[PDB]
Amino acid sequence: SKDFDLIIRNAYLSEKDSVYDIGIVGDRIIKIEAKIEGTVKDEIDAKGNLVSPGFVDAHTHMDKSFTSTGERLPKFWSRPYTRDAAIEDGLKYYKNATHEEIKRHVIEHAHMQVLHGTLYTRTHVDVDSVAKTKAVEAVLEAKEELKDLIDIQVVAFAQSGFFVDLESESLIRKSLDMGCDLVGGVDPATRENNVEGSLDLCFKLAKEYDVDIDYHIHDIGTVGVYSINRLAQKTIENGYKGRVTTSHAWCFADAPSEWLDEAIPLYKDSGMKFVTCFSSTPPTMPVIKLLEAGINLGCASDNIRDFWVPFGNGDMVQGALIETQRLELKTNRDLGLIWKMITSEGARVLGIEKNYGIEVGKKADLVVLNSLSPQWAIIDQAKRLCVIKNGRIIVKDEVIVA
Amino acid sequence: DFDLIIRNAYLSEKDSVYDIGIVGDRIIKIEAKIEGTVKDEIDAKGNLVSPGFVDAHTHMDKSFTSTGERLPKFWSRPYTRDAAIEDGLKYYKNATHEEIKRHVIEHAHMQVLHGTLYTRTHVDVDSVAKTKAVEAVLEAKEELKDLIDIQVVAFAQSGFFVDLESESLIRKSLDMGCDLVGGVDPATRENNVEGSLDLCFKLAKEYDVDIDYHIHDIGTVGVYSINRLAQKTIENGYKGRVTTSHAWCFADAPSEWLDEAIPLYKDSGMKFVTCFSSTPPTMPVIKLLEAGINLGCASDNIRDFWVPFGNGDMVQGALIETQRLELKTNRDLGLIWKMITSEGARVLGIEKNYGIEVGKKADLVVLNSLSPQWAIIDQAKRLCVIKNGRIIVKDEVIVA
Ligand SMILES: [Cl-]
Ligand SMILES: [Cl-]
Ligand SMILES: [Zn+2]
Ligand SMILES: [Zn+2]
């Protein structure tokens, strides 16, 4: 009987630089107008504040999150981080971890994300000889139970290395067969000790299940740049343009700048996408340079409260503040670039850009903020007012009401 | 018996949970259980209770001047020091005593809501501001004494040798009651390192005040300038009475320059403050701390023409430092917690009355987190803030 299922009144829209009413029917934005007349079931008044599309946390580890919790001090952080140690910690952990513990962590992680207005995430999940597909199974189960809260892509993740743990290949195939959405490895050079082999193997598996690729490349300096360049060239050779993401690419921060300058056309040609996580972005990462060159660069938590990262609130607005401090940004323009990173850049990384944004016909997945603008939100860190997924209110005043 | 009791307080220095009994502005008893009941109690419920945070470097006078539009004002252009100086001279031309006092009070309220109970603010003194900003700050200070303790640095923002009115104005500012004196960039602002430093000492000594110097200059010219400062500190009988703010040069100068200078800094008792709005990612924070250097922490500017950020929140500042510096271990987060607490106290000179021990001041923050590490990680809002043994903040409202 009624003209709109939901109307958000008085919404400041950063892309249009003005205040509008937003009219929603079902899971779709139907109308954006200075003032909407018509009958409506439910309304939310944004009161002139910013309303944003849902945030995108383009790289998480939901499977092993919150494992540092339960004592006065974070567990595991009596010692400094190294990749190989954190790998051994993970193999020890998954020996006895239960399906229910892992599913609980994934749900807790998702709840924390959605409370902060993240509506889309791409999680990695550990696949190795100890975890087997136990973690994958729990993640895919949770995913299904969370589908009214948050959209999740799952990367089948060969955390130990295809050429280090030889069971990885069979187990990743199974993980893909089970329904993982992407495949990925780690450090073709310093973990695998076999750049060409590891990358070729990832493409073989990807192609078998017709999935996209998200690769963890931590390696610094010229060995990092070399490894991403090999990845990018293989992307072209395999007919995989636009289907490959490189996570981290810390090497862009310490390799000679001329190495990045030479590789940019290759990245554009291959449609290589990137993710920088705010838990590790190097201070001298050329974020603004990448963005100005037209490179797709999303943003993410990475791990939350585990034996890799003790931090994490699953909050992209807090992450955006963290980036501005890491990178030493202040201008309104630069804060605006960070805001695109946690929104529309992420959407592009995830491949959802056609249905993402506050425009007519797009999905009604939205966050009403308590701040005036992207810049003021990053600065003031005000809590979210309301979160809307599939045109239904799922968070109101710091509670999940879905 | 007790005016206030905090129940079930985790104390990080003792690594256990205690009841805390308070009479007047003093902590009187710390025991596993305090027998009996009193009118005013706060239950920490096993979470951390901390001494009040110390924001060792602010600019309360010109805070919140970027506010009032959809986008922050001023930030259509990148920062440089000399441009921010011009912005400040333009702003203070017409800024009123009441606007400035209002911003100071807003800033204080924001700080105390996050559990900061002690701050050292600089205040612009130059030919345009004159002592108008000084006046307003001292006036707000007096009105805020039940909320927060404020030290005021008479700050020659434009340079003693660039704005020649600075000297006379700073003398007046001290006469009016500023607690400290300071300048900026002896080398690249003043173009006279010996002169500027000697002048600051002359003025300091006339009014028997401490020194807090802004030294942003990077690399070897920064280290040189801090070294000249520290030598002059010894020459002037000023050991322990001088702080150097920023010292960004420690980050990019050859590490052997800092290694050579450390004994000089220890000999001179030089104190330092690194502000979480600019700490360079390669600043050798942990190195300084392990060498026993006193290194406090601070907001610097909040929402103005120098820095667009700021929530006046030292716990958020601590998280920012861990990200700038790439820290993760429980030990390192512990060190950052000392920076926002007891290191600050030592910078400000209030260490004897600072801490959660019997006989110390009942200036306390009850957190909603288990531990210093968990508080930096989870960023939970403060539950209760106590100043001079009186509850001033409860659940995000100032109730004083
Ligand atoms: Cl950048
Ligand atoms: Cl009271
Ligand atoms: Zn990761
Ligand atoms: Zn300052």
Author numbering:
A (entry chain A): 2 to 403
B (entry chain B): 4 to 403
Sentences from the paper on this structure:
The malonate (a poor inhibitor of AtzC) adopts a planar conformation in the structure and packs against Trp309 (less than 3.5 Å away) as well as interacting with Lys65, Gln160, His219 and Asn304 (2.8–2.9 Å, ~3.2 Å, 2.6–2.7 Å and 2.5 to 3.0 Å, respectively). Oxygen atoms from both carboxylates of malonate are within hydrogen bonding distance of the water bound to zinc (2.4 to 2.8 Å) for both instances in the asymmetric unit. The bound water is also within 2.7 Å of His249 and Asp303 as well as close to the bound malonate moiety. In the malonate:enzyme structure presented herein, additional electron density was found less than 3.5 Å from the malonate, above the plane and above the water molecule (about 4 Å) bound to the zinc ion. This density has been modelled as dimethylsulfoxide (DMSO), which was the solvent used for inhibitors and substrates which were used in both soaks and co-crystallization experiments. Although a malonate bound AtzC structure was obtained, the structure of AtzC with its substrate or product was elusive, despite concerted efforts. Although malonate is a weak inhibitor of AtzC, the high malonate concentration used in the crystallization trials likely prevented other small molecules from binding in the active site.
